Structure formats: C-alpha cells, structure tokens
Amino acid sequence: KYNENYQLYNKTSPDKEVKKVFTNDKDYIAIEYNQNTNNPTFFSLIQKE
C-alpha cells in the first residue's frame, strides 16, 4: 500500500534491516553489522499524486 510504513530487507540478509546512516555528513541507507544499538527505520512508497 502507498503511504504505509514498512521495514525493508534485502531478501538476502533478513536478519539485518536496511537502516539510514547519519553518522556521516553524506547520509545514506545501508545494512549495518555492528548492531550495538538497534533502532528501526520505516520505508513507505509514495508517489507525487
């Protein structure tokens, strides 16, 4: 569904969730392996209309 938040996985590493990375100025989305702190991020599919 549009405008509904889900958790994103790569279908290859379902144990690790795609999480946005903000520790650097160039923010991006990556799968992290340290996992010292767990905080999920939600991805929702949105179109212009």
């Binding site: 279908k11 290859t12 590493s13 379902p14 144990d15």
Partner: protein, 1265 residues
C-alpha cells in the same frame, strides 16, 4: 584489492614471489629425487608452477598407458611442458585465466576467499605457527632456505593433458575441519568439449546461426573455477570421500565401467546432477563440520595467547566469537558460510555469472575428442568476455562452438575402449555406449547414526538459511588481503600421512554372450562406415535389422515410411522441380513420422509415449513383442530399464538420550531436539533413497536417451547420404547443382530440428516414468523401517518422560507427552520440490522457451514511441503521418492511409525467410466500420513484403486476405467477415513450409492451405506497413504488436499466445479495450440488442426504474441492418474514491446513469424480483455498490454485474425481464435476479446471454450518423 602479479618465466628469482620450491609431496617414495620447480606467486598464497603434475600414484606416469582406459576423451603427451617456451606459454595462459576470473566480482570474491582461508595452524607456546601443511619450502643446493605460505599450488596437467584435478596434501586435515594445502593440475589450452545436443530446450546459440552441430567447448576460466571450489572445500575441512557412486556392477554385465564418482564432485559441478544429492551430502558435511570446528576451537583455538597474523587469518576464516581464551563457534553464520561454500559456490552458478555454457550433466553421455585452443591470442579469447567476444551482435554462447576455426582439433592417441557383445561377425560396441548403472550398494556401509541427543545440539536446518548469494555481498576480505606473507625458516613437522586419492581402475576387455539381439545390435544396424562413398553406393533404407547388419549398403529404418520416399525414386532425376518435390516430401514425412506420440489418459500420468522406440530400440520386445505402448502399461519402468535394483537401507537403530542431573528448561529442549532429530533422520533416509534412485534409475534413463539420439541421428545421416547421392546423379541439368546443394543443407537442418523435437518428446515421457517410479515404488519400501525407528524413538522418549517427570512439572509433562505421541506417530512427507527433473521447471518458462524465444520482430508502442519490442532490429523508419492511438493494452499503431503514413522495416537476416523456413505472423487489428461506400471490391494492402514475389496481408471488404506468391505458385486465404466491425482481432498466420499455411482469427482456425508447392518468397525490399490502393484518404486501421516468429506455432501455442494477451484480469468493453473508471459508456445486454438503459420514475411507488430503451437499428452502406450500439443513456463507471484506473475482474463499482447512482433497494418494499433503481427519488434507500465480474472466459467483451447482498435481498446477477407489472406500458425492467447467481454454473450457455452486458464506448471507427 588483491593484485595479480604479471610474471614471465624468465624473471629472476626474487625469493619472495619467484622461488624454486621443493614439491610438497617430497616424502613419497615415487617423488624421491624430483628437484625444485620454479614457482611464481600470482596471488598472495597462490603459486603457479609450470610443471606437469606427476606427484601422486594416480598421475605418476605421463606416457600412453598402452592399455585402454575408462575415459574416451584423453590426450597423452609426455613431452609437453618440457621446454621453457611451453612453460612460459602455460604460465601466461594461467595468468590470463586468473585475470579473467578476477574480472567479474564473483571471481574476485572467490579468489579472495581462497587466498584468505588458510588451513588451521598448529599451536606452539600459545602462538599459531605454520607447518608443511600450509607452506612450500623454497630450496637451494639440497638445503631448505625458506618456508613460504601457500594456500594453493597450481601445476600443469597430469598424464591426461586435457584433464583437471584437485588434490589435498594430508589425509586427516581434509575431513576433520583443520583444512590443508591444495594442488590443482589443469591445462588452459587443451580442452574437453561437451556435446549439448538434446539437453537444454533453451536456444544455446543464435536463431539464424545455421548451426550444424551444437557441440561447445568449455571455458578455461570455468574449468579452473571448478577446481577453486575443491580448493575451498579442502581449505575449510569439508571434503569427505565416503559419499561415492560405485559404478562397478557385474550382474547386468553391460555397464559403462567408469571410475567411482564422489558426491562432492557433483556438488562442486552443480546443476541438474547436484540436485539429486545436494541435500544429503550438504547436511552430512555441515553436521559433522560443526562438531569438528567446535572441538578444534575448544581444544586448539582457545589455547592461544598470541595475536599473530595467523590468528587474524583464522578469525576471518572461522566466524568465531568471544575473547582471547574463550572462543565459541557461532553456529548461525558458520552454517550460513558452509552452505555458501557448498551450495552457492559451484561450477554452474559461477559459470552462469560469467556467461559461460556448461554441460548440464557432469557425466559425459557423448564424449567428444579433446581439442587445443591458444587462449593467448586476444582475437579468440579475451579476459573481459571470454570465448564469446560480443562483436557486431551478441554471441550468446556462439563462440563456444568447436567449429570456430581457433579450436584446433587433435586426433586422439588414446586406445579405444570397447566391449565385444559376441552372441551364440559379432558386434564390438564402444564403452561410451554402455549403460551407466551404479552399484546398488554404493550408499551402503554408510554411518546413518547419531550420538546421544543432548541439549543445544542445534541440528542443521537447511530451510531456515537465507536464500542464495552468488556474489557473496557479505564476507568482506579487506582484512585478510592486507596481511603480508610470513615466510618463516623453521616450521612444525606435523607428522601426518599423505593423502593419496583413489587409484583409477584399469579397463578390462570382456566379452558378452547373449542369446537375442540387444539394443546395441539395433544401434549398430543403423550405422554405415565413413569409408562408404556417398556416390556410386546408394544406402537403401530397410526394415530388417539382420539384412542391415550384414549388408554395408543398406540401413535399418523402423520408420518404414521414409524408406518409401527415400528409395523407389529413380536415380538420375531430370529436373530441379522433381528434386524439390522429393526433398519437401522427405522433410514432411520425417517431421510427421518422428512426431508420432500415443497419449494414454491415465489421470496424473498421461504418458505421451512415442511408439517408434519399439522397433528403433529393442526394449519392449521381450515383455510384449511388437508392442511398445502396451508394453509400458504392463511395466512402466521394468520394461524401459535393464536393471531394477531392489534396494536396501541400513537397520536404522533408534535414537537415545543422555542421563544426568538435568533441569526442566533443558530436558524440554532435549525432547524438542529428539523430535527434530527424528524428523531430520526421516528426511536423510529419504535423501539416501533419492540418491540411490538417481545413481541407478535415472542414469539408465539418460543412457537410454543417448541411445535414442544415436539412433535418430544415424537415421538422419542415412537420409543425408541418400540426398547427396541423388545430387551426385543430377543428370537432368548441368551446373545447376549449387541451389540444390543449398536446398539439401537446409533440408538437413530441418531434419535435425525434427530429430530434436522427437528427442524432446522422448525425454519428456521417460523423465516422468522415472520420477513416478521413485515416488511410488521406492519410498514405501523405506517408510516401514523408518516407522520402526520412529516407534523405537517414541518408546525411548516416553520412558524418558516417566522419569524426570517431577523435574518437568505435571503441565509440562502433559504437553511433552502429547507432542511426542502426536508427532512420533505420523509419516513425514517426502519433499520432491528439489527433484532434478520436475514439471514445474518445464512449465514456469513454457511461454519463453516455446513462443517468445523465436520472436524476431515485435512492432509495438512503448513510452509513446513506436519500436521493435523484441529488440532484434532498429532500422524501422516510420512516416510523418503515422500516429499512436489508444489500443488493446498500450498505445496502438494507427495507419492513416494517406500514402505518407508509411512504416517500413529494412529487411535483415532475421526477417529473410528462405524456402524451407517456417514462419508465423501474429498481429492485432482494429479495422473501422466503413462509413461510406467508395471502397467495396477494391482490395488494398495492409502489410506487404512483396516484389511480385513474397507475402502480403491485404484487406478487402470486411475480409482479411493472406497471400503468398512464389515465381509460379500462390496461396490466397480469406478470413470470413467481421474484420471491419471495429473489434480487436488477433490474426495469426502460421506457415509450415512442408505441410501448409493455417490462418487463425482470435485463436480459432479459419483455413489451412497446401504450401508445399511454394518455394521462394524472399525479396530484399523492406516490410511495408501501408494502405496503398485505398480509394478513401480518411480510412485508417489500428495495429498492435505485429510480431513475426521463426517457427510454425501449432494450435496449442497459438491458443497459448492468445491467452497471454489476457493475462491481466481487466474487464473488456465491446471493442476489446480495457474498461476505465471515469469514462461514460453505453450499456446494453447481450440479449435484446439495440436497447440501451434509460430511466422512468414511478411517483406512486416513488421509484426510478432502469429500463431498456426503445430498439433502433443502423443501416450499413452495403444495405444490411444491424442493431444500434449508441442507444439510450450513457452510464458512467465510478469508484468509491475515483481511482481513475482500469476496471478489474472483481472490483466493486458504482454505475452512475444520467448523474444518478444505480443500485438495488435496501428495504422490504421491493420484494418482487428486486427491480434495480437509481438515487433519483429519495423515498427508498439503495445499496449502490455493484460488482463487475467475468465468470466466463477472460477475453469476452462482456461482463456480468453482480448486485450487493444486503440483508433484504440475496446477491444476484444484473439481468432484464420483460413485463408489464401494473397499468403502465409493457417494458423491459432491469432486476438483480438472485436466482441466476446461485445457479449460474449449472445453466446452459444460452441462458447466460441474459446476464451479459456490453458497456459500449463511443469510439471512432464505429459511428451511426
């Protein structure tokens, strides 16, 4: 990150990259005196040694053995790699292969993994130290100077200079998880081609290649990349030789006599062969490797108090966790990594990532003579692409073919391996033709046992692992590619025994005495020696094997119908017409007669038995002489196979548990683990019997298929011998043989296509038989022993709960007892989704491999631009007055017929159809209704490839004409009518040059005409889409998905292609377009044509009834009356939220006529037939939400309108009844008809007319004015 060092054999010895090693097997007595060899470190811990591998007893000798061997493809050349020039060439070739592997990311990951995963080093004073199991000794003057680290040593080939092999170094470290050094022997120049002639139904080469033979040569990159997987297995302590197929069977006495095949070997190759044995060997290896690595870490890795670089290597290789002094093997990622090593990393997956063709079978049914290729010549082999250097078009495994002029063929000096079947001139049949029957006790003597089921056993769950990762996105190697090489001087001895692989058995010459003609007799009866000259000798096809056996001229043909058209024709044909007629008759008879199948209709079996295998192969003559289809019924497999094994499996002792001062939370885990272990034992015994089936039953099926291919190919070559003899006697004319020779070449191509279709049928019906035997007659034998084991386990566990019950507690005891009683009383189903050959694999891509594979043109519209959707050609130029209009699924091509709306496709080699090339043309058409009478009787073309010779699709008055014109002959096929009714019609014309041209409209056959007299319809003028010879300048036509295929689609594929266009569940209006959500439509019933919907208001009842309006008719220009479509009021389909999409199969809609929503009453007022009203009039409440459905076929241009179920009215299908309920006039009232919906599927097709509705759009091309 890892660097490949570019070295030359003349480079001076650095001592760190170029050394003179002492061979690691120097302790063996056969290797005494073999001096140091020059070695070049190509990658860190990987060394190339350009010397012949002659260090094991298997490869001790390099000369010709002077005795027949068990391998048909072998080259023996002792004086190879004996000179510095050959050594330099070999070194450069190996470096080129390695940098070809490194080019792709998967190969880079594999090379990093090999260079990083060192064997487990020894412990000394708390520090990890290297031993001779991991180091090579660089030596001068009979004195070892430095031991350099080496995970892999690459030599030249062994005795067989075309063979590849991987060997370990020490016996125990290979299997106990320690890991060991590996030695890989391979030649990158000498190759062993594989004959892929009947395995892959997918096109392995180009469609217009004119490929005589589909014999490919392997890629040296993939040949080496096979041995890299074995190196990884050795380095991780994975290889176990206990799972092997013993191919030594003496009872059948007709066995291929091959060396024992390790299950690790098929797992490494991958593909079809691995799927039969994948789960068993992988599960066993992972289960034992977890224990081995846990023991190693517990006793060795935990006794390390030094942080040397070897510790970094080990921590990266083995996914341990914890701290120094306490290391624990984390089972999750360790199991995942082992699965990736075994399952994901294999020859087939890596080769497919490298775009390289593989054999699809590790076993060689048709071995080919090994060849020689100079990969150093960059014109032929390139590190970026490989053999298939894409140039002026994608090769798609085209450079792999062994006729590519750089694959230098070599005559084989290996002695022939034959068995003499010499009954009482007696036949000598090659070893490669014998049946491949593995011994029935090959998997006996296996362990099939487990220790006491303790807590935290954590049995391996292959189904809980994440899916495949071919690229290995995880497992970074930057940590281990920055570690330098140690190169210590003194190493730990590690006194262990050398690993000597199985010494290959010697082929023995044996003779067989049989009392009746065997299948090998039947094959050899269909053979003629190449010493027989095609001219001066006419090979007359016969029907008796005995005559063909003795007389070299004649050939045995069980077809007994080619022999009529092959013989009986006078030699010295006087005209090319006769040599074309005979030549097409040959093609037609061979294609029609090898396609003979018998579809017996036993449910869920439905064997499509081809009967001609009966006399082609002496199979079913013993059980029922003269009948083969009947012989299959009596015995499905016993007749088809020469050996029913009557298998057996070990006694399967029941499992047990530990005894001690346990706890509740862990004895419960013990019970759960025992249940899981029982489940895995059931699955493991099922996998064992599946492996036995594959070894003994399926390999016989494969060799039967090979025998069938031999028989059919020799039938085809006998036909070719006769054709070329006939050409050698062309007495009719002089110097006109060239065209006849081209005709014969194309005819041979057609014969090969017929042969491959016949073999597809044969394989299709044999694979099903073998799978049925496995599932029906094999598992039930196992289930009895498995049930006995299950009962023993249940007894042991239930006794384990009577004790320790107080520790559990009464509730947990009750739950555990219930779980044990329920679970350990059933039968665990056999999971066959991973079976090697399955129908689902053959059906999931049926449309891609049977229809879309042969598409050479598909003219459509994408993103608002007209283009070839297939992508074969791009020189399609369209006129300035061509437009794109709304069409069937996406915009449609609209030819305005103004003589400037010309589309033309410059003809290329794909669209050039020769005399013998079948072809099909499928296109959607929407032809407007003729609005004026000035074009009747004037035939005008629609799309023509015509230069007073060729094909032409034209449109006469509402009839579509398909025309072929040869130099003298022609065909004209006319569709009936209704082309000009403004409806989307799919016309598909299939031309089988041998039999006839068939025209289907909307998937239904119209007419078939003989095309056997038409020969050349090829002209170089572009295919022209135009409306020339049209007297109307405003006349147009919508075209969509005009596609051309290079095969004759039969009725099944035609109806499949017609379903494909309705894959989506859209609702279609009368024209055939999808139904939208904000467009106003005229609404009419299929019954009572010409009447649209209107409303009338009843003030006394306060109800706005929907009623079919007064009928009206339209007059055609040809003075034929038809029911009007634009009648009544325009209803507007809507949604509860105005989605503005396309209407689908079961969407919930809201019809809005004249601005007022339509619906059924929502109270008890209207209990008589449930008349449908509108929101006009607020006295009664309505339930507006309708539901469009299509209960009939998806392509129908009408839809049913199911009414909602409110509590007052049952759900019904919107229909109409003609009545006069009260004093108002006699009308047609629309009502919900709750009765039709309930009994819809029982009604006949005539009553369904009442419920259908058309939803007429106002569309240009149909207008009543």
């Amino acid at each position: 990150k890892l660097e490949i060092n570019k070295f030359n054999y003349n480079d001076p010895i650095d001592g760190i990259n170029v050394i003179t090693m002492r061979p690691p097997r120097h302790s063996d007595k056969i290797n005494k005196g073999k001096g140091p060899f020059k070695a070049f470190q190509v990658i860190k811990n990987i060394w190339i040694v350009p010397e012949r591998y002659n260090f094991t007893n298997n490869t001790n000798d390099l000369n010709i053995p002077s005795e027949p061997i068990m391998e048909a493809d072998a080259i023996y050349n002792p004086n190879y790699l004996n000179t510095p020039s050959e050594k330099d060439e070999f070194l450069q070739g190996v470096i080129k292969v390695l940098e070809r592997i490194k080019s792709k990311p998967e190969g880079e990951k594999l090379l990093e993994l090999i260079s990083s995963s060192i064997p487990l080093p020894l412990v000394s004073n708390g520090a990890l130290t290297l031993s001779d199991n991991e180091t090579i000794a660089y030596q001068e003057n009979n004195n070892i100077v430095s031991n350099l680290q080496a995970n892999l040593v690459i030599y030249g080939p062994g005795p067989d200079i075309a063979n590849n092999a991987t060997y370990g170094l020490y016996s125990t470290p290979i299997s106990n998880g320690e890991g060991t050094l590996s030695e890989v022997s391979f030649s990158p120049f000498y190759l062993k081609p594989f004959d892929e002639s009947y395995g892959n139904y997918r096109s392995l080469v180009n469609i217009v290649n004119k490929f005589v033979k589909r014999e490919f040569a392997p890629d040296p990159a993939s040949t080496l990349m096979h041995e890299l997987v074995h190196v990884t297995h050795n380095l991780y302590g994975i290889s176990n030789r206990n799972f092997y197929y013993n191919f030594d069977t003496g009872k059948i006495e007709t066995s291929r006599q091959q060396n024992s095949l390790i299950f690790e070997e098929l797992l490494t190759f991958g593909g079809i062969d691995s799927k039969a044995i994948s789960s068993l060997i992988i599960k066993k290896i992972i289960e034992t490797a977890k224990n081995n690595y846990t023991t190693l870490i517990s006793e060795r890795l935990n006794t390390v108090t030094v942080e040397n670089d070897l510790l970094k290597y080990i921590k990266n290789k083995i996914p341990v966790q914890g701290r120094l002094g306490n290391f624990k093997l984390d089972t999750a990622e360790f199991e995942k990594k082992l699965n990736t090593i075994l399952f994901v990393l294999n020859e087939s997956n890596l080769a497919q990532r490298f775009s390289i063709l593989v054999a699809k079978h590790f076993l060689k049914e048709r071995p080919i003579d090994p060849i020689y290729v100079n990969i150093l010549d960059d014109n032929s082999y390139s590190t970026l692409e490989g053999f298939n250097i894409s140039s002026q078009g994608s090769n798609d495994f085209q450079g792999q073919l062994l006729e590519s002029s750089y694959f230098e063929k070599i005559e084989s000096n290996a002695l022939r391996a034959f068995i003499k079947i010499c009954p009482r001139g007696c036949i000598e049949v090659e070893n490669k033709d014998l049946f491949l029957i593995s011994n029935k006790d090959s998997l006996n003597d296996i362990n099939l046992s487990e220790e006491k089921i303790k807590p935290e056993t954590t049995v391996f769950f292959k189904d809980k692992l994440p899916p495949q990762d071919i690229t290995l996105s995880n497992y970074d190697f930057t940590e281990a590619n920055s570690i330098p090489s140690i190169s210590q001087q003194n190493i730990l001895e590690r006194n262990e025994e050398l690993y000597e692989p199985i010494r290959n058995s010697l082929f023995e010459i044996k003779t067989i005495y049989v009392d009746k003609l065997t299948t090998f007799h039947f094959l050899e009866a269909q053979n003629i020696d190449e010493s027989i000259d095609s001219s001066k000798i006419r090979v007359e096809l016969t029907d008796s094997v005995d005559e063909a056996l003795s007389n070299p001229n004649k050939v045995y043909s069980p077809f007994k119908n080619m022999s009529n058209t092959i013989n009986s024709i006078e030699t010295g044909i006087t005209s090319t017409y006769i040599f074309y007629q005979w030549l097409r008759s040959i093609v037609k008879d061979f294609s029609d007669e090898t396609g003979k199948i018998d579809v017996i209709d036993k449910s869920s079996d439905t064997l499509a038995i081809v009967p001609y295998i009966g006399p082609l192969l002496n199979i079913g003559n013993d059980i029922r002489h003269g009948d083969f289809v009947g012989a299959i019924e009596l015995a499905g497999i016993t007749a088809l196979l020469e050996y029913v094994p009557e298998f057996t499996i070990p006694i399967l002792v029941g499992l047990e548990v530990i005894g001690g001062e346990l706890a509740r939370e862990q004895v419960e885990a013990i019970v759960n683990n025992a249940l899981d272990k029982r489940d895995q034992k059931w699955a493991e015994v099922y996998n064992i019997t599946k492996a036995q089936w594959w070894g003994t039953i399926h390999l016989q099926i494969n060799t039967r298929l090979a025998h069938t291919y031999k028989a059919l190919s020799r039938q085809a070559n006998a036909i070719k011998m006769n054709m070329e003899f006939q050409l050698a006697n062309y007495k009719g004319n002089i110097d006109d043989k060239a065209k006849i020779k081209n005709a014969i070449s194309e005819t041979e191509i057609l014969l090969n296509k017929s042969v491959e279709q016949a073999m597809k049928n044969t394989e299709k019906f044999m694979i099903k038989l073998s799978n049925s035997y496995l599932t029906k007659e094999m598992i039930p034998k196992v289930q009895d022993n498995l049930k006995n084991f299950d009962l023993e386990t249940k007894k042991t566990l239930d006794k384990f709960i009577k004790e320790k019950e107080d520790i559990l507690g009464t509730n947990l005891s009750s739950s555990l007892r219930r779980k044990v009683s329920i679970r350990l009383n059933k039968n665990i189903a056999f999971d066959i989704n991973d079976i090697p050959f399955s129908e689902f694999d053959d059906l999931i891509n049926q449309y891609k491999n049977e229809i879309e594979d042969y598409e050479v043109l598909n003219l459509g519209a994408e993103d608002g631009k007209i283009k070839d959707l297939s992508g074969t050609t791009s020189d399609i130029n369209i006129g300035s007055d061509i437009e794109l209009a709304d069409g069937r699924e996406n915009k449609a091509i609209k030819i305005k017929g103004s003589e400037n709306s010309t589309i033309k496709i410059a003809m290329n080699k794909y669209l050039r159809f020769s005399a013998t090339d079948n072809f099909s043309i499928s296109f959607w058409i929407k032809h407007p209704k003729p609005t004026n009478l000035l074009n009747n009787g004037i035939e005008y073309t629609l799309v023509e490839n015509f230069n007073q010779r060729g094909w032409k699709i034209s449109i006469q008055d509402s009839k579509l004409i398909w025309y072929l014109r040869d130099h003298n002959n022609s065909i004209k096929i006319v569709t009936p009518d209704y082309i000009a009714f403004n409806g989307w019609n799919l016309i598909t014309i299939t031309n089988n040059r041998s039999k006839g041209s068939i025209v289907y409209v909307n998937g239904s056959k119209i007419e078939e005409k003989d095309i056997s007299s038409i020969w050349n319809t090829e002209v170089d003028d572009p295919i022209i889409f135009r409306l020339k010879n049209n007297r109307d300048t405003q006349a147009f036509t919508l075209l969509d998905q005009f596609s051309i295929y290079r095969k004759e689609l039969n009725q099944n594929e035609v109806v499949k292609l017609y379903n494909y266009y309705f894959n989506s569940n859209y609702i279609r209006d009368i024209w055939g377009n999808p139904l939208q959500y904000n467009k106003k439509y005229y609404l009419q019933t299929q019954d009572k044509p010409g009447k649209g919907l209107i409303r009338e208001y009843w003030s006394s009842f306060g109800y706005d009834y929907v009623i079919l309006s007064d009928s009206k008719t339209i007059t055609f220009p040809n003075n034929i009356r038809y029911g009007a479509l634009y009648n009544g009021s325009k209803v507007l389909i809507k949604n509860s939220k105005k989605l503005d999409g396309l209407v689908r199969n079961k969407d919930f809609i809201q019809l809005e006529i004249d601005g007022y929503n339509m619906g059924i009453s929502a109270d008890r007022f209207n209990e008589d037939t449930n008349y449908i009203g509108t929101t006009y009039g607020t006295t009664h409440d309505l339930t507006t939400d309708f539901e469009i459905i299509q209960r009939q076929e998806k392509y129908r241009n009408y839809c049913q309108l199911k009414t909602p179920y409110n509590i007052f009215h049952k759900s019904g299908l919107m229909s109409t009844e003609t009545s006069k309920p009260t004093f108002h006039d006699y009308r047609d009232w629309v009502y919900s008809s709750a009765w039709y919906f309930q009994n819809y599927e029982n009604l006949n097709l005539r009553k369904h007319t009442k419920t259908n509705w058309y939803f007429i759009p106002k569309d240009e091309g149909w207008d009543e004015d």
